[PDB]
Design a protein around this motif. Structure first.
Motif, PDB file in Angstrom:
ATOM      1  N   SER A 179      29.938  53.830 -68.391  1.00 14.70           N
ATOM      2  CA  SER A 179      29.089  53.717 -67.207  1.00 14.70           C
ATOM      3  C   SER A 179      28.028  52.623 -67.285  1.00 14.70           C
ATOM      4  N   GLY A 180      27.888  52.000 -68.450  1.00 12.73           N
ATOM      5  CA  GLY A 180      26.902  50.950 -68.626  1.00 12.73           C
ATOM      6  C   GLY A 180      26.687  50.615 -70.083  1.00 12.73           C
ATOM      7  N   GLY A 181      25.918  49.568 -70.341  1.00 12.02           N
ATOM      8  CA  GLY A 181      25.642  49.166 -71.704  1.00 12.02           C
ATOM      9  C   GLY A 181      25.116  50.304 -72.555  1.00 12.02           C
ATOM     10  N   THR A 182      24.130  51.029 -72.031  1.00 11.64           N
ATOM     11  CA  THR A 182      23.517  52.121 -72.772  1.00 11.64           C
ATOM     12  C   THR A 182      24.549  53.150 -73.229  1.00 11.64           C
ATOM     13  N   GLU A 183      25.458  53.561 -72.342  1.00 15.92           N
ATOM     14  CA  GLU A 183      26.476  54.539 -72.732  1.00 15.92           C
ATOM     15  C   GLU A 183      27.379  53.986 -73.822  1.00 15.92           C
TER      16      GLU A 183
ATOM     17  N   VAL B 215      28.530  45.088 -82.509  1.00 14.30           N
ATOM     18  CA  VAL B 215      27.976  43.920 -81.842  1.00 14.30           C
ATOM     19  C   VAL B 215      27.596  44.239 -80.399  1.00 14.30           C
ATOM     20  N   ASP B 216      26.294  44.277 -80.136  1.00 16.16           N
ATOM     21  CA  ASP B 216      25.783  44.535 -78.798  1.00 16.16           C
ATOM     22  C   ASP B 216      25.924  43.283 -77.940  1.00 16.16           C
ATOM     23  N   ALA B 217      27.126  43.073 -77.413  1.00 16.12           N
ATOM     24  CA  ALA B 217      27.388  41.925 -76.551  1.00 16.12           C
ATOM     25  C   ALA B 217      27.315  42.311 -75.077  1.00 16.12           C
ATOM     26  N   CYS B 218      26.490  43.306 -74.766  1.00 19.00           N
ATOM     27  CA  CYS B 218      26.380  43.786 -73.398  1.00 19.00           C
ATOM     28  C   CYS B 218      25.963  42.663 -72.463  1.00 19.00           C
ATOM     29  N   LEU B 219      25.154  41.750 -72.979  1.00 19.50           N
ATOM     30  CA  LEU B 219      24.709  40.630 -72.168  1.00 19.50           C
ATOM     31  C   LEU B 219      25.671  39.454 -72.313  1.00 19.50           C
TER      32      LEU B 219
ATOM     33  N   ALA C  85      30.466  45.440 -74.172  1.00 19.97           N
ATOM     34  CA  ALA C  85      30.281  44.390 -73.179  1.00 19.97           C
ATOM     35  C   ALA C  85      30.134  44.975 -71.775  1.00 19.97           C
ATOM     36  N   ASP C  86      29.254  44.382 -70.968  1.00 18.33           N
ATOM     37  CA  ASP C  86      28.963  44.886 -69.624  1.00 18.33           C
ATOM     38  C   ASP C  86      29.719  44.162 -68.520  1.00 18.33           C
ATOM     39  N   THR C  87      30.681  44.848 -67.918  1.00 21.66           N
ATOM     40  CA  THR C  87      31.423  44.282 -66.805  1.00 21.66           C
ATOM     41  C   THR C  87      30.559  44.233 -65.554  1.00 21.66           C
TER      42      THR C  87
ATOM     43  N   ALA D 222      17.166  44.459 -81.396  1.00 15.06           N
ATOM     44  CA  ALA D 222      18.252  45.271 -80.855  1.00 15.06           C
ATOM     45  C   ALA D 222      17.734  46.118 -79.699  1.00 15.06           C
ATOM     46  N   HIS D 223      18.590  46.373 -78.712  1.00 14.59           N
ATOM     47  CA  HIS D 223      18.153  47.044 -77.485  1.00 14.59           C
ATOM     48  C   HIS D 223      17.580  48.447 -77.698  1.00 14.59           C
ATOM     49  N   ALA D 224      16.612  48.806 -76.857  1.00 15.70           N
ATOM     50  CA  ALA D 224      15.938  50.098 -76.940  1.00 15.70           C
ATOM     51  C   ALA D 224      16.911  51.258 -76.804  1.00 15.70           C
TER      52      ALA D 224
ATOM     53  N   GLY E  48      20.679  53.372 -68.439  1.00 12.33           N
ATOM     54  CA  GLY E  48      19.707  52.351 -68.119  1.00 12.33           C
ATOM     55  C   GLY E  48      19.996  51.889 -66.707  1.00 12.33           C
ATOM     56  N   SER E  49      20.872  50.902 -66.583  1.00 13.77           N
ATOM     57  CA  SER E  49      21.328  50.460 -65.276  1.00 13.77           C
ATOM     58  C   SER E  49      22.218  51.525 -64.648  1.00 13.77           C
ATOM     59  N   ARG E  50      21.925  51.855 -63.396  1.00 16.20           N
ATOM     60  CA  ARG E  50      22.666  52.872 -62.667  1.00 16.20           C
ATOM     61  C   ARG E  50      23.190  52.261 -61.380  1.00 16.20           C
TER      62      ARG E  50
ATOM     63  N   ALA F  88      24.165  40.007 -79.320  1.00 19.75           N
ATOM     64  CA  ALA F  88      24.809  38.751 -78.981  1.00 19.75           C
ATOM     65  C   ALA F  88      24.877  38.520 -77.478  1.00 19.75           C
ATOM     66  N   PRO F  89      23.736  38.174 -76.855  1.00 14.11           N
ATOM     67  CA  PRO F  89      22.433  38.008 -77.482  1.00 14.11           C
ATOM     68  C   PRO F  89      21.643  39.286 -77.334  1.00 14.11           C
ATOM     69  N   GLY F  90      20.520  39.377 -78.036  1.00 13.25           N
ATOM     70  CA  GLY F  90      19.564  40.444 -77.813  1.00 13.25           C
ATOM     71  C   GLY F  90      18.923  40.242 -76.456  1.00 13.25           C
TER      72      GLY F  90
HETATM   73  C1  LIG Z   1      21.302  42.947 -74.218  1.00 14.50           C
HETATM   74  C2  LIG Z   1      21.488  44.314 -73.637  1.00 14.50           C
HETATM   75  N1  LIG Z   1      22.037  45.314 -74.418  1.00 14.50           N
HETATM   76  C3  LIG Z   1      22.205  46.574 -73.884  1.00 14.50           C
HETATM   77  C4  LIG Z   1      21.825  46.843 -72.570  1.00 14.50           C
HETATM   78  C5  LIG Z   1      22.033  48.229 -72.009  1.00 14.50           C
HETATM   79  O1  LIG Z   1      22.892  48.156 -70.891  1.00 14.50           O
HETATM   80  P1  LIG Z   1      22.568  48.918 -69.510  1.00 14.50           P
HETATM   81  O2  LIG Z   1      21.110  48.775 -69.124  1.00 14.50           O
HETATM   82  O3  LIG Z   1      23.393  48.255 -68.432  1.00 14.50           O
HETATM   83  O4  LIG Z   1      22.897  50.384 -69.683  1.00 14.50           O
HETATM   84  C6  LIG Z   1      21.272  45.836 -71.781  1.00 14.50           C
HETATM   85  C7  LIG Z   1      20.843  46.070 -70.361  1.00 14.50           C
HETATM   86  C8  LIG Z   1      21.102  44.574 -72.322  1.00 14.50           C
HETATM   87  O5  LIG Z   1      20.553  43.599 -71.533  1.00 14.50           O
END
Ligand SMILES: Cc1ncc(COP(=O)(O)O)c(C)c1O
Ligand SMILES: Cc1ncc(COP(=O)(O)O)c(/C=N/CCOP(=O)(O)O)c1O
Lengths: 451, 452
Positions: B110-114, B217-221, B251-253, B144-146, A296-298, B190-192
């Motif tokens: 590399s990110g929340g999605t990964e 728990v999707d605590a990416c945010l 979690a997203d650093t 929940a995230h796409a 998603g975010s890159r 947490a949160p969506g």
């Molecule tokens: C709540 C939430 N979960 C998951 C993601 C996926 O993380 P990313 O876009 O950084 O890959 C995002 C962006 C998000 O805002």
């Protein structure tokens, strides 16, 4: 082995109060001065591909000016979306994208592995939709990159690995043999990572067009080397889109493209193919969401460094770099065949896999490691390889290598019993059963993550 | 729309001779001065999370000193392997990793999605090996995230989305209803991302431990926001590893961790779980090859920026940042409820989803866009959201937002017929059928990749 366990404070908890920026930088810079002589002076196989301190200082400025870029938002940073579009286009052209009608398209990915994974997923999704294939197979050489196994496991594709011939190139016959009606793609490496040899792409590509399936060319290593070696008058058949059977190609802008680490290009012959890669969700309460790749975010900035490196070099800079590398290569290979006990695997252009029939090649390798050489340990068959980069084109580096290589063989011929350091490890790894290696390595990755 | 198609030369071919470094940088710096006012002055929802020019100049030095790092080679850059180990450890502690026995472990991604993808693949691989489940299902809220759908498609998991309640939080009952013996994991946000609300994690976590499956728990945010909001005395239940049912957390650093873009942490409760994530090949002529995550070669430097940002801030810098954000939030929410036609969705702490029953919320949104606000368009239900960052804590930014919001509602109440700019697009997108959107967006991603 963890080098800074003692010299620097370990953090398993956030510091109650933030440490000063001046200090954090100094800690990191110190580690920089400790680790950078290894790759800079030319002791590393691959790893760092350019290394020149001005080219690096340049790309760091590129990163700095684009640090905030996130191409998930093309409306906030249209600059990065531009870079990505042009890296994909310049790369397409370079790999015979015009000789295909100009329908060649792609996306920028995070590395060779993602490119390969994305491709496999594309062919899998296409095969199911058009040809109704619900238990897909892929057929690649046993030399094709391990990233292919990764795609097999992730996406549920049955991977079939065919044997090689005497030159360690793919066996085009055994590939035909393993093709079934459920086969959705075949692949060839240009070059493969293990031995630096280029599979018979024209033949494989043709074999593919024959059965109406895909042919992927893993040019992650060769993408930015082969086209220039061809114009320098070397023996390289068409490996790219000039061949009509070839439906996709992957190339690493962070390897021999001399970008910064974390970029790569995946290219497809027609857009109707690319489209199976895009991910889209319309039913999500979070709104419209789409992404070209896995992420998603890159890091937008890394797309910038790939773009900036390609422009700063142009066809000249690549032609020049490629010559200086292939020169050092031919020169190293001569020095190796000259040495009695050693042989080279197949006919590599710049990625040299050296083996031995008489000696324990792993101790040879360990003897090199003694002088500071960080080399790659291969097996099936046992050998070590060195992938040459601009770092090995500097004065006296191929020489020091051949010099240290002679002394290393002489030492191992005097004591064929000798097996010190890592030699015994690479050797056990060769003989051990898959499920045992799978377990010991799992413990090793856990050791990396300890504080 | 492509802004620089005319002002700058387009390259569909490598320049015969290399262009000068001085020039290339100037081209890029110019684009920097054009695009950076938007996020810097506070007009962007999310996107840039810190924004302070000294914190950025700092992380850029971190990148510069580690630019060459590739953690595929831990023996060449043991420095990066150290950073990664410590980012994972500091993050584990932060999310109640001690209250779990100290078996909590993870990797840097590399990110929340990964993170999410890796997790889904882990639970899928675990379920097959231990519980023999060969047609896996996952159960998550519709909020929940796409990225979850992405994992469903990639790995062959049947994803089942449950409905929400009046507060737009997950419906814990409907989750129990959809669980089968093939269900391998349930998740809570947490949160969506959509509404900024925290699903009932304690309840979901318990529901999970009950059926002997995983709870992610999707605590990416929220990873780097919720633990500090809790100590600032806010209404946040335990969302992390304090709860025993919770088997993994992401979690997203690079989000509220204030690292640079391209880093994230995935954490597992026990190592026997993590291990299903590692990829290993022993039979390859290329030798021994392993990787913790999806990637082979990684940007080591981004792992450094995450590490360096966490150390430069410490529990103080996060506590401070989190306060300045949640203050701006509570202050913006009051200004929104104050406005007659608008309502807020659920009870968000800092990610505000604003809707309207009387007006066309998309034109409200477009009226904001007129003043420079880059906001996020939601649907099902129709709304727009703004996720607050340090960029919105600067002087007078929440004010300008509320000021421009009033004028925007007043304008749309005067002409309920009005639908300009993007408003009609977000509105069609809401009503159109999946397979039609799937096709138009595919054409849009192709437009992004064109060179003139
Ligand atoms: C709540 C939430 N979960 C998951 C993601 C996926 O993380 P990313 O876009 O950084 O890959 C995002 C962006 C998000 O805002
Ligand atoms: C033929 C082939 N295919 C795929 C890959 C994987 O690409 P990646 O994900 O590592 O960017 C490689 C690289 N293999 C080695 C990557 O580490 P290095 O020593 O810094 O180059 C490859 O050679």
């Amino acid at each position: 082995i963890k080098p800074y366990r003692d010299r620097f404070p370990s953090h398993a908890r956030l510091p109650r109060a933030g440490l000063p920026r001046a200090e954090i930088l100094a800690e990191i810079a110190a580690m920089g001065a400790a680790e950078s002589p290894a790759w800079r002076d030319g002791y590393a196989s691959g790893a760092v591909y350019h290394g020149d301190e001005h080219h690096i200082a340049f790309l760091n400025e590129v990163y700095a000016l684009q640090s905030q870029s996130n191409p998930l938002h093309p409306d906030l940073w249209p600059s990065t979306a531009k870079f990505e579009a042009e890296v994909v286009a310049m790369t397409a052209h370079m790999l015979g994208g015009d000789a295909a009608g100009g329908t060649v398209c792609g996306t920028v990915t995070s590395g060779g592995t993602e490119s390969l994974l994305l491709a496999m997923k594309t062919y899998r999704d296409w095969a199911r939709a058009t040809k109704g294939i619900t238990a897909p197979e892929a057929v690649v050489p046993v030399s094709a990159h391990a990233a292919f196994d990764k795609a097999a496991q992730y996406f549920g594709i049955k991977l079939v690995r065919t044997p090689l011939d005497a030159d360690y190139r793919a066996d085009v016959a055994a590939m035909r043999e393993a093709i079934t009606p459920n086969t959705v793609v075949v692949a060839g490496s240009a070059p493969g990572y293990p031995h630096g040899v280029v599979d018979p792409i024209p033949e494989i590509a043709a074999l593919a067009a024959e059965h109406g399936i895909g042919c992927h060319v893993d040019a992650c290593l060769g993408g930015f080397i082969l086209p220039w070696a061809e114009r320098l008058g070397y023996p390289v058949p068409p490996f790219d889109f000039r061949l009509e059977g070839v439906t996709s190609v992957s190339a690493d802008t962070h390897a021999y493209g001399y970008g910064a680490k974390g970029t790569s290009v995946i290219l497809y012959r027609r857009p109707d193919l690319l489209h199976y890669q895009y991910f889209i969700a319309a039913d999500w309460p979070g709104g419209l969401y789409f992404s070209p790749t896995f992420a998603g975010s890159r890091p937008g900035a890394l797309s910038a460094t790939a773009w900036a490196a390609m422009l700063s070099l142009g066809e000249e800079g690549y032609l020049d770099a490629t010559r200086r590398i292939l020169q050092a290569a031919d020169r190293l290979k001569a020095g190796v065949r000259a040495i009695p006990s050693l042989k080279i695997l197949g006919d590599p252009l710049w990625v040299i896999a050296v083996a031995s029939d008489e000696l324990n090649i792993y101790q040879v390798m360990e003897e090199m490691a003694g002088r500071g050489w960080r080399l790659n340990g291969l097996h099936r068959p046992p050998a070590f390889h060195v992938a040459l980069t601009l770092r090995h084109t500097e004065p006296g580096v191929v020489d020091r290598f051949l010099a240290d290589l002679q002394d290393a063989v002489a030492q191992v011929r005097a004591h064929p019993e000798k097996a010190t350091g890592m030699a015994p490890v690479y050797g056990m790894a060769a003989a051990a059963p898959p499920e045992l290696v799978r377990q010991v390595l799992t413990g090793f990755i856990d050791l990396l993550y300890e504080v």
